[PDB]
Design a protein that fits this description.
Chain C: Belongs to the bacterial ribosomal protein bL20 family. The structure is cut from a larger assembly and holds chains A, B, C, D, E and F. Chain B is an alpha+beta fold. Chain B is 37% helix and 32% strand. Chain B has a single domain, classed as Ribosomal protein L22/L17 (Ribosomal Protein L22, Chain A, Alpha-Beta Complex), CATH 3.90.470.10. The chains are: A alpha/beta, B alpha+beta, C mainly alpha, D mainly beta, E alpha+beta, F alpha/beta. Chain C binds three RNA strands through helix 1, helix 2 and helix 3.
Chain lengths: 150, 110, 117, 103, 56, 142
Amino acid sequence: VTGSGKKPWRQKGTGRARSGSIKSPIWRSGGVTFAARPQDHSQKVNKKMYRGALKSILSELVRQDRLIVVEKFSVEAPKTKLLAQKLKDMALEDVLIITGELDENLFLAARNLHKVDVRDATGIDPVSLIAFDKVVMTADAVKQVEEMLA
Amino acid sequence: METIAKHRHARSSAQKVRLVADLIRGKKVSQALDILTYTNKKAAVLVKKVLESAIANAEHNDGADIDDLKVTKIFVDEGPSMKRIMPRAKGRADRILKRTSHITVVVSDR
Amino acid sequence: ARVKRGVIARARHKKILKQAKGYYGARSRVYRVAFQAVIKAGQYAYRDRRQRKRQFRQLWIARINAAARQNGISYSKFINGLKKASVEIDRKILADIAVFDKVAFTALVEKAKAALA
Amino acid sequence: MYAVFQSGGKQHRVSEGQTVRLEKLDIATGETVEFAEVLMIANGEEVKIGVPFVDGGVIKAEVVAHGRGEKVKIVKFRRRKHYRKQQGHRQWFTDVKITGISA
Amino acid sequence: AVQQNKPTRSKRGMRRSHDALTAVTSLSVDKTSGEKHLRHHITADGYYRGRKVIAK
Amino acid sequence: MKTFTAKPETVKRDWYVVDATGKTLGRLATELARRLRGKHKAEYTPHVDTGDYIIVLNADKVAVTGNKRTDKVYYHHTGHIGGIKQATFEEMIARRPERVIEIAVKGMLPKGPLGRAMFRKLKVYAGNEHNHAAQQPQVLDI
RNA sequence: UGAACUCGCUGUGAAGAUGCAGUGUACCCGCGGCAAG
RNA sequence: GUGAAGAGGGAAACAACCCAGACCGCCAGCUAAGGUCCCAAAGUCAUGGUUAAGUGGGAAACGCGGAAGAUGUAACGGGGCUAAACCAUGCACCGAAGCUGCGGCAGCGACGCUUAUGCGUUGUUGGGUAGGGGAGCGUUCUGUAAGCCUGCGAAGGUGUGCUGUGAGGCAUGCUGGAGGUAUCAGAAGUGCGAAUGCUGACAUAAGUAACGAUAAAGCGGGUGAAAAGCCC
RNA sequence: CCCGGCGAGGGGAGUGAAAAAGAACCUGAAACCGUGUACGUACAAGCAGUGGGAGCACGCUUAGGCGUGUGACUGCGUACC
């Protein structure tokens, strides 16, 4: 705390409590008994734990029918309107397009929309998987997820 | 009929002016005017000015015939107080509170 | 992250002031003084809850003894006669009957005397 | 015309047509209840019990309320022993109206 | 020489009860001018006992 | 249910006349105080004055067993430099005989506003004549 | 300046009681003084 | 053995003496020590006795005396008692949060059974300092959550009725005006009543001291609403 | 516009959703000081309350209490770390 260590008043004779400096926690223009520090909050999770959690999430989605398997899912042109039509035809609103290979057309089409988000099989997180209402898969995406999970 | 008149940030103190306020609380204008005129207080003239303002407001902004007017609700309350510093013996400093009072007068026919 | 306690302090102080409401002087305005009054008042209420039983018991004792001596018999003799006659009316009801219906109390004392004799 | 009877561990004296508050009962809020344990019945003349619960005296009542009493705060506070304890209580009450008295 | 504890507002009011002032309630009206003035005091314009005394 | 309590407005207080001739001071004062406190009635309430009015006559005819006739000493302090005064029962009777029984009753009765009220209810007269016949004070046998 | 609806005596009490139990006394509220607490 | 770490009743008032160990509620009964003339709840209870002393309700060697202290009776609590003082016996009443009668909460071990939980149950315990263990309430923000409420009215403020053993929660009368946030998890500068704890405002003494060398102001006229203090 | 002292300040008029949004100005709480209503208070002593508790002033259906405020009186009660 910016300031000085000078005693505000002499320790003896005064009718006020014992004070050593203006920076004390019970003083103003400075204090804070326990000042926070920049610290890393990352919590390490084992690779086996992460893989098991991902497998459990996939199994739960399959059981609840939140995972829909489909064939090639591509857009002819990077048109958000075309993507919206292709999702409204099947009546899907909150969706994660998990694809084996990332295509710029679909990525650009889905970037603007927030309810529909595109991701690659490698780039998947359990938090997003569970949060998204539905997850639509491709054959290659399923095969590579299976081989990665082992 | 309210014809309320209030004087704010008065120099006098609320404690001092409450005496004058209670002197005329519930009396008629005819007696109150002379009572304030012959009262030996600065608060007397301070409250007389407010009473005159109330009577004039009743006469102009509302019904005439101010003769049948009685001060129904007269009161005084402390307002903002100014702080000053005064030296004393042995280098001490004391704080002087210049007090101000708002005086409110409501006079009605009934 | 700052967690301002103004709202909680206001709520607790208002609750304590409401509990202390009705007291005299600063006991009903100052939280630091009102709070102590509420605890002492509650302690007194807890004690007086038990005290009420004994106070009413002795009040009924006095009422029944007074009525019996008015008719000319001791309270202990009255109770002994009632027990011998198998009268299970409690002291509260005995006092209430003595207050309201004098004929009922006269019958009670007559039966007590008959049982004693 | 007033009857004294024991209902919920305490004896109540009630006149005809009035209402009495007593301990909670396992009776519906709109149901009739009977009290054959009438300890005393009084009228212009006096009839007393040589044996408790008379012989044929009976009181018929109709339940009106099955409520809870006013909130009572129990506070324990130990002086200089660092202890304060708070509790709330609302004793259940059954209110009935005495609709009939027998002889 | 100093208070052992602060008095109460009730005690302050008890002390101040006698501090209240008193109204004259003795207004007098001039016989000639017919104007309100304190008894034995000359009027604002300068009339006393009917006859003017200040001549100003 | 709810407790009955005597209501001061609807209270009937009888009137009695008691002669203190040949009566023990303490025993007579006991009965007088019981009557004043209403412990002879089925309507007494600790916070309500329910007792009857008693008029004591021949207050100079009280009797005390043993040497209490002269050994008894009544002390009183006037709250002054050395104002403590003692007077025996004979002195009290000579000056005014009412005060001995009045002090007896005051010490017999509880202290407080209600105690003062019941003490006022009592009316003492040194002589055998009283001017309260308008209340029909039937003589009490005790 | 913890708060007071702020009288004296006896005995007690962390051992010198305005507030404990008893006792006696005391209309409520200001003003000029002494300073035992 | 008690306080510390136990409240309650008696000793008037007194932790350590006596009876008695408060899980919570009910305007029920009983009893322990201790009381039954009253203050102040209960026997002016009985029988056979002593006491003439206010002993009871302070004290020895000696023959009721011995026995005198200081603010006020002050060595029964008092009134007062010649039995209302003391010895022996009996029968009755009062007497605590102690026990019993009813209702409500929970741990512990069990068996008859439900088996991640009810119990047709069974017995008991639940004063508690330091301390040890377990179970919960209040708030900021993050994911949940670009979801939900929301200008036909959020939050704060200000009262009310319910609700749980409780921290608090719920809905609503008025100001308010655009923000708040379900449930489950994550982290706290996360809950203030004292540390002669700090900052800002207001009581208090109190409309009291004081209004600052005891060189000394007044009168006629003038301005001004106000003149003893401004000007001639 | 009016009063007030060609002041300060306030009552009218207008602006503005809002003027207890008026520059001392968003929301406007407590300590503290007042106004009005109802009660208690000038014969009664003490951690100021509590259990009981009559009366008084306000409303209700019923014609008795029930709801709030005051609460004389009575037993107990020598604050907190």
